[PDB]
């Protein structure tokens, strides 16, 4: 059976806050297509073969 992820529980309270004292810098790669192949078809030659 597929696992959705880890089980976590936020310790919520009336007067409890969590504040970071340190950080990290990340570099993430995002890949996106832009253009495809500029094909062309010779219709008469493809159908008939001269």
């Amino acid at each position: 059976t597929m696992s959705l992820g880890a089980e976590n529980s936020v310790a919520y309270s009336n007067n409890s806050i969590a504040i970071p004292t340190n950080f990290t810098i990340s570099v993430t790669t995002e890949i996106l297509p832009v253009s495809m192949t500029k094909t062309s078809v010779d219709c008469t030659m493809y159908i008939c073969g001269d």
């Binding site: 959705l4 992820g5 880890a6 089980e7 976590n8 529980s9 936020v10 310790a11 919520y12 309270s13």
Partner: protein, 49 residues
């Protein structure tokens, strides 16, 4: 029938293209369902309070 199947084999590879297109549609639907909802990394839960 069998003669219909033989003439369908003579017509070539249209059915494979249609089956491939429908398979791509189904995989894309699964990808959309994953992409919209599966954004959180961990399964949080509410406190009893």
């Amino acid at each position: 029938s069998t003669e219909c199947s033989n003439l369908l084999l003579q017509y070539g590879s249209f059915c494979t293209q249609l089956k491939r297109a429908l398979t791509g549609i189904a995989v894309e639907q699964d990808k959309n369902t994953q992409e919209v909802f599966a954004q959180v990394k961990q399964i949080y839960k509410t406190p009893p309070i």
